Scaffold this active site. Structure first.
Site, PDB file in Angstrom:
ATOM      1  CE  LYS B  32      -4.007   1.860   2.599  1.00 17.22           C
ATOM      2  NZ  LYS B  32      -3.481   3.234   2.639  1.00 17.22           N
ATOM      3  NE  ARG B  46      -1.946   0.511   6.036  1.00 18.46           N
ATOM      4  CZ  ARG B  46      -3.000   1.034   6.633  1.00 18.46           C
ATOM      5  NH1 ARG B  46      -3.931   0.257   7.158  1.00 18.46           N
ATOM      6  NH2 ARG B  46      -3.087   2.352   6.746  1.00 18.46           N
ATOM      7  CE1 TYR B  54      -3.820  -1.853  -1.859  1.00 20.64           C
ATOM      8  CE2 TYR B  54      -5.545  -0.488  -2.807  1.00 20.64           C
ATOM      9  CZ  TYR B  54      -4.708  -0.795  -1.756  1.00 20.64           C
ATOM     10  OH  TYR B  54      -4.665  -0.045  -0.631  1.00 20.64           O
ATOM     11  CG  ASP B  68      -9.966  11.822   3.933  1.00 19.81           C
ATOM     12  OD1 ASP B  68      -9.512  12.721   3.208  1.00 19.81           O
ATOM     13  OD2 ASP B  68     -10.194  10.689   3.535  1.00 19.81           O
ATOM     14  CG  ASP B  73      -8.687   7.702  -1.846  1.00 20.92           C
ATOM     15  OD1 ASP B  73      -7.463   7.960  -1.935  1.00 20.92           O
ATOM     16  OD2 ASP B  73      -9.398   7.771  -0.774  1.00 20.92           O
ATOM     17  CG  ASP B 105     -11.889   7.291   2.327  1.00 22.93           C
ATOM     18  OD1 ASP B 105     -11.959   7.024   1.103  1.00 22.93           O
ATOM     19  OD2 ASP B 105     -10.910   7.914   2.829  1.00 22.93           O
ATOM     20  CE1 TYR B 142      -9.487  -1.238   2.423  1.00 27.05           C
ATOM     21  CE2 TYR B 142      -7.238  -0.780   1.680  1.00 27.05           C
ATOM     22  CZ  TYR B 142      -8.495  -0.335   2.067  1.00 27.05           C
ATOM     23  OH  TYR B 142      -8.735   0.995   2.040  1.00 27.05           O
TER      24      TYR B 142
END
Lengths: 179, 179, 180, 180, 179, 180
Positions: B32, B46, B54, B68, B73, B105, B142
């Site tokens: 990630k 991480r 992914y 946030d 994203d 999110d 995940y």
């Protein structure tokens, strides 16, 4: 606002014990990439002259300087290959003393602090002995077909590694003042 | 003249419908990566704590901001893996609403506008249903081995996605003025 | 000389049940669920996994073993490198992973490759990093979830339990396949 | 039990001609042209492709089929993942790709893997993106060009035509190989 | 102090004969990356429309300009794939003359000067003939499914390549003055 | 028809000893030392290499050859692409690599793939770049060093010497395996 990875990236709050590390070479690579100090780009220094590959991700610590005029090098143990140019957080677990073509070139052995498998290691002694032998052999051999000699000595504990890092942090800060 | 990928790269003429997207994570990756906001470099956030990867290329939209404090994203469907740090042109085809550790999110689901296979999709409903299930399951799972909960809700149509993008464009422009 | 059916014609090896030949079906990192076709001895695609998950390690079976589900005993093999489906290697059991898959028992061995210099020195699953065990457990709990199949994974059991399970499979193979 | 010749000893399957076992020879993305060695049943390198091209999908043959060129019927299999040469899978025909290779007919099946959750639901090549079809056609037109060999690829034909071609191969195998 | 790879990276002391080359596309790639001139980032221009892959590493020469307003392109022969965005030292061994959609677009064929296998080549004639055929065919074919025509002509010797490079160096220096 | 043991049942080929079938055991770039299991004809993991080294090229053996060490004759095959273990290809010898491994002679053929358009035109190891030869020599000198095993590699010998060594292996196989 776009960073030079050696000058502009911070070493990180937990330095010297925990530090940002800029990866130059991916685990399994035969390509020896290195930081181009002037531009901050990654360049191909050479293709290795033997059928050998880097045993682990490899790079350097931002805002560090050694007697050879480069940042301090780090081998980073973790589950996954990381791409050149990307940085990660690492914990030092040992120092690997070497002499390359008569010149001292000690390197840190670290783990990725954000790898759930590896982040819990604190000392190179906790690694399987074979791993250490593989690392030592790699550094002894990777420049052999270029008729260059690299002597690799017994690894030294984390407290020595951390002193080496702090010293490179000092040498960098002393170089930055003149400029 | 070298760009910070969040600040300096333009969102593109066709925004919010068509936008530049900076890839952080390659399809198939267990690493990630994420943008480091300060430097604009890619960093290892991480290694994933599960044996998951992914399902598609993943990144963010330049000159966007969410509640946030990060860019918006995007999951980008296309034939080929793309390298972290490279940008591409994407068309939004859906919004994926999520709650991660109690925090909203939402993420865009897009296609690469320059992929001859995928550029012709306009709506997430045109995808095989299994694909959607695979995506949903990935986001649910995940971070499970980190004892974090992610709720993933039914995907919403392109017109909702595009409103989300326009809103993040506004929030960014409002943040840039103060500075 | 004869080309071998990998279940029937490959020997389990001199050190069994402790150390045994193991036939790899699935490579570390694979989303393809290959399996032994028992009739032909070929490798077949059983399915592509229904989630964005991958096998955490090399996975296969022990030759000349039988379980009540009519299949050889399954093994997860830890080692430095991916191995190709259809190739065999020598492995040492370091534990047993008790599971229930769609209400049926399906225990699997956890092992290390006996000829990998890094991993051949492990004797017990408790010597592995705790995270490693959690990742493995989660995989088996998750890998069939999008097929609406349930797998419960219980706490891993020691090498002496693993070895007993292997010995039992060896006996069931001799009873049901070899001797009738 | 006997280890199998993949052409002779692997069954075509209960659902044939609609759904059939397929043996992969070449993996998606490969520049190596592997093929079945009919004599041994092994996989051999026929050649490295003479252009910078790669197989667009997994490619293989149907067991217990025969064509006038003395070979099993060829199949291009669409699915999410690369499959290893020598492994078999279950496929459903969704079309036929008529071609002429160096003046000889060489029709090939286009299929999907029946056990891939993404692709198993396709029934007809017309359900694929138009670009996909163009890429496939171009591959077969181009892959032998630097060997100065000509391949003309014609418009793809529907599943019922595919299925008829498969049934015919099955009959020719039974006639020429199995029964004499 | 972080470089734009076209403007800020030097061409190198041995130019035009030996030059820094910024890789855009890796050997074996179906992704056509290219430099984004404005930002200096790598972007996905397209996924190739055929089942073809780049036969070798591919990129451009910093501080060069051609009549099409882009830097001069280079195909770099070497043992290993190189990552987009990384630069290397290359020696020109030929010029490949092409016409793409009626427009002249000549490209250098080079070797990596730091690859022990390939650094010793000085002329494209020293390559196996099949290699040249494979390269020629790639450029003829890679845009065919986009209904674009690329004519590729007989390769020209190193002395021609080096003149082409020197000319692009001049055209760049002439563009930099106005700004 | 019969599925083949790759040592016994695969023919060496019409052009032997000059040009011969070769069975790949190890792929270019691999750290896994696979080998033929002589009993079953399967591929087995002999070991993971004990250094951070990788095979510089595809590596395998010639079918229906025998050496005094009781194994087929070994071959390093240069070509554009990695080949899968267990597959066979056609190769032309371009030299012989004389070695001593733990005090025992172990000469190996250096060859090119006869069906690779790039490499099929080489006839002699002296046509390769000098660096290539140095890399190959260093590999064999280094690959068992961390097992405390010594391998001395001597200067490579010409194709006519290679061909003689192959012919001799062919004769030893006929003498010891085929005819008794």
């Amino acid at each position: 606002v776009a960073a030079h990875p050696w000058h502009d990236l911070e070493i990180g709050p937990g330095a010297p014990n925990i530090f940002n590390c800029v990866v130059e070479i991916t685990k399994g690579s035969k390509v020896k990439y290195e930081l181009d100090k002037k531009t901050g780009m990654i360049k191909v220094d050479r293709i290795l002259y033997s059928s050998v590959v880097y045993p682990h991700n490899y790079g350097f610590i931002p805002r560090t300087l050694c007697e050879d005029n480069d940042p301090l090098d780090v081998l980073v143990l973790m589950q996954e290959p990381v791409l050149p140019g990307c940085f990660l957080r690492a914990r030092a677990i040992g120092l690997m003393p070497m002499i390359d073509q008569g010149e001292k070139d000690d390197k840190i052995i670290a783990v990725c602090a954000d790898d759930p498998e590896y982040k819990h290691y604190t000392d190179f002694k906790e690694l399987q002995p074979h791993r250490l032998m593989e690392i030592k052999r790699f550094f002894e051999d990777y420049k052999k077909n270029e008729n260059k000699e690299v002597a690799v000595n017994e690894f030294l504990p984390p407290s020595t590694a951390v002193e080496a890092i702090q010293h490179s942090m000092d040498l960098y800060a002393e170089y930055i003042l003149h400029t």
